[PDB]
Design a protein around this ligand. Structure first.
Ligand code: VG5
Length: 370
């Protein structure tokens, strides 16, 4: 009953239905493994179809403390409190959780996105104002008998809370360690573009951290890695030449409907640290993932795309574009993240997204930046 409980797209996020308060107020909440605050619109906003009304909830408790949260994209401020929370298409439980009532915001809410709030699924270490503000998932686990694990199949999609749904993936689940419990931090040991190694000291891939982040759209790479990757992707696709603006995400690329030349763009393989010394596995993604479709009836004689790999000065972010088509298990209990090919893997008649291993490195270097 938890299958297909997500709606949305990489560009504007994936969201799950929740209720807050007593009597229950229904809100759509973006699922974000890249933050740790649970927050809902709690005042009128041009892009909000609805919002949390604390005055109507008899179970609302004000903590008399304000909070401010900046993201890569957008920021908000609100008032902290607690209230009862349920998930209609998740486990049938009711938890009292911390909730930030958003009363001011800038470039956070998205026009026509259909969500009114955000569920930060990462660890307390990155919650605001500080790590004493217990995150929702921790409250869920402490107060119910729900196992300390969840999985995401982003396609719509599914969030399976408390376990793994085997009908959502094929083949093997490969696990990479959670290096530190704050973000879901992982380690990338190798990057290939069409099978060709970028030939970088592997610490560069994780400067200064690498995270798995359902709340970010793009694959975001450290500048040095980004430049190397774009150079290689340009070379692989050189049968066609695009404006610099495209590679910077400042411009769409369009082809006549149905003629997108997928085959001129390379596959990208990210090798993740395994659970055993010097072993790794790889996930391979196709251009169908990193060229993000931009829907617009005005342009619809064409199919148009944005380049969904971009630069970062705060480390690698494996965003929704990377997670799409994979079944990703956030196994908090065992401090590891699992990857498998999803029931909604994309692929065409020549190539397929994949998760495969084991691979061995002869290099003993630790790829962690710190
Ligand atoms: C889905 C919307 N698209 C979209 C969203 C973000 C973004 O900032 N998402 C946040 C959630 C969100 C979701 C929807 C709307 C706003 C924010 C995540 O929480 C980001 N996670 C890490 C990187 C972070 O900054 N965490 C903070 C650390 C400090 C304490 C609080 C958590 C970034 C891009 N970007 C920016 C450049 C390339 C890209 O894809 C596109």
């Amino acid at each position: 009953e938890m299958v297909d409980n997500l709606r949305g797209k990489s560009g504007q996020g994936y969201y799950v239905e929740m209720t807050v308060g007593s009597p229950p107020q229904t809100l759509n909440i973006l699922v974000d493994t890249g933050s740790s605050n649970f927050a809902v619109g709690a005042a009128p906003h041009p892009f909000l179809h609805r919002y949390y009304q604390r005055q109507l909830s008899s179970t609302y408790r004000d903590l008399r403390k304000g909070v401010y949260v900046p993201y890569t994209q957008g920021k908000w401020e609100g008032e902290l409190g607690t209230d009862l929370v349920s998930i209609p298409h998740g486990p049938q439980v009711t938890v009292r959780a911390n909730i930030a009532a958003i009363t001011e915001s800038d470039k956070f809410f998205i026009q026509g996105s259909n969500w009114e709030g955000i569920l930060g699924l990462a660890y307390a270490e990155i919650a605001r104002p500080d790590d004493s503000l217990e995150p929702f998932f921790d409250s869920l686990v402490k107060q119910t008998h729900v196992p300390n694990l969840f999985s995401l199949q982003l396609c719509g999609g599914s969030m399976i809370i408390g376990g793994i749904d085997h009908s959502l993936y094929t083949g093997s689940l490969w696990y990479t360690p959670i290096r530190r419990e704050w973000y879901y931090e992982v380690i990338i040991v190798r990057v290939e573009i069409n099978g060709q190694d970028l030939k970088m000291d592997c610490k560069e891939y994780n400067y200064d951290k690498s995270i798995v982040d359902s709340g970010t759209t793009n694959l975001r790479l450290p500048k040095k890695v980004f430049e190397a990757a774009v150079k290689s992707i340009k070379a692989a696709s050189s049968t066609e030449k695009f404006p610099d603006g495209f590679w910077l995400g400042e411009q769409l690329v369009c082809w006549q409907a149905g003629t997108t030349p997928w085959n001129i763009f390379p596959v990208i393989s990210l090798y993740l640290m395994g659970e055993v010394t010097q072993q790794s596995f790889r996930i391979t993604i196709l251009p169908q993932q990193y060229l993000r479709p931009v829907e617009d009836v005005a342009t619809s004689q064409d199919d148009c795309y944005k380049f969904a790999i971009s630069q970062s000065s705060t480390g690698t972010v494996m965003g929704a574009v990377i997670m799409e088509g994979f079944y990703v298990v956030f196994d908090r209990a065992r401090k590891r993240i699992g990857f498998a090919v999803s029931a909604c893997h994309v692929h065409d008649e020549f190539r397929t997204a994949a998760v495969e291993g084991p691979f061995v490195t002869l290099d003993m270097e630790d790829c962690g930046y710190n």
